Amino acid sequence: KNRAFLKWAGGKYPLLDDIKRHLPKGECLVEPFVGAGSVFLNTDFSRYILADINSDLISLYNIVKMRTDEYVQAARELFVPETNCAEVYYQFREEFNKSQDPFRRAVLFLYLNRYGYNGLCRYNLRGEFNVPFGRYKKPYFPEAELYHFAEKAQNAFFYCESYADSMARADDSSVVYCDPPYAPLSSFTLEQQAHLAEIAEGLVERHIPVLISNHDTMLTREWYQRAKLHVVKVRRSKKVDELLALYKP
DNA sequence: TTTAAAGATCG
DNA sequence: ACGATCTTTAA
Numbered sequence A: 001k002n003r004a005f006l007k008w009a010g011g012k013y014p015l016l017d018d019i020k021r022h023l024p025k026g027e028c029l030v031e032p033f034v035g036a037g038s039v040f041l042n043t044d045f046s047r048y049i050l051a052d053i054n055s056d057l058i059s060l061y062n063i064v065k066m067r068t069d070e071y072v073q074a075a076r077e078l079f080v081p082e083t084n085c086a087e088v089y090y091q092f093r094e095e096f097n098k099s100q101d102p103f104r105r106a107v108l109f110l111y112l113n114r115y116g117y118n119g120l121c122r123y124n125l126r127g128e129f130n131v132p133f134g135r136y137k138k139p140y141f142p143e144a145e146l147y148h149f150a151e152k153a154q155n156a157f158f159y160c161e162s163y164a165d166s167m168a169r170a171d172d173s174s175v176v177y178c179d180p181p182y183a184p185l186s187s188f189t190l191e192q193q194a195h196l197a198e199i200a201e202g203l204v205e206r207h208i209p210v211l212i213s214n215h216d217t218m219l220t221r222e223w224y225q226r227a228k229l230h231v232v233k234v235r236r237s238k239k240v241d242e243l244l245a246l247y248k249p
Numbered sequence B: 001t002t003t004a005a006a007g008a009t010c011g
Numbered sequence C: 001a002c003g004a005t006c007t008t009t010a011a
């Protein structure tokens, strides 16, 4: 199991065992919601089409890919004991929000993810990163995880776009895995949740396999009805489970 | 400017 | 999810 170098919501690490099982084989893998890219890191496809709506996330992935050795050295400088305090953190957070340089923003982004509160990625409406100090004992610098990502990203394309646009890149040789934001138990709207199901069925009609992972609620079944629904008993956090929607042509 | 509800902010 | 504090929205 390969861990991503970023703390990210919906890591789906324990689900990797169940995903790979129900994930069809093909040449290309398309992920409209790549996020940390845990699925991308723990699979083996010829090509990858990875996309996310987060511009800072996508920009980082291209910096790490193209300028690996340069980035790792510059980013290792921030993971020192002297940077593990509030005063330094908020200045680095400020420098990030004011920087125009993609490289410098990419370097600080890893710092803010590892030193920030719970590894959250929160912005205001100004597009400014506003996550407070995390106050950890000793933040880990994922040097091994970075090099593993870079060597694997060589067979991948990164795009900053919505799910609708990225799924349009899918073809015969491509297999699609969708990991949308979690469905409400009781921002990603419900219309976008249902719209994802519409495209998935339009793709499987064009002989293109699509796998979707989400929570197990009454709404998820009503959207994913046309797929072979498999369930995994996580039963954690009322006890809710995770639902797998597979569209096999 | 008034007003009351709602959204946004950020530790 | 929390919450004290601004900002927003429209008659």
Ligand SMILES: Nc1ncnc2c1ncn2[C@@H]1O[C@H](C[C@@H](N)CC[C@H](N)C(=O)O)[C@@H](O)[C@H]1O
Pocket: A008, A009, A010, A011, A012, A032, A033, A034, A035, A036, A037, A038, A039, A051, A052, A053, A054, A161, A162, A163, A164, A179, A180, A181, A182, A188
């Ligand atoms: N409309 C959207 N289109 C494409 N991506 C989106 C959209 N909305 C949110 N996202 C991204 O989808 C991701 C949701 C995450 N749960 C994905 C987790 C991902 N599977 C991982 O291993 O980390 C986030 O990175 C979002 O930035």
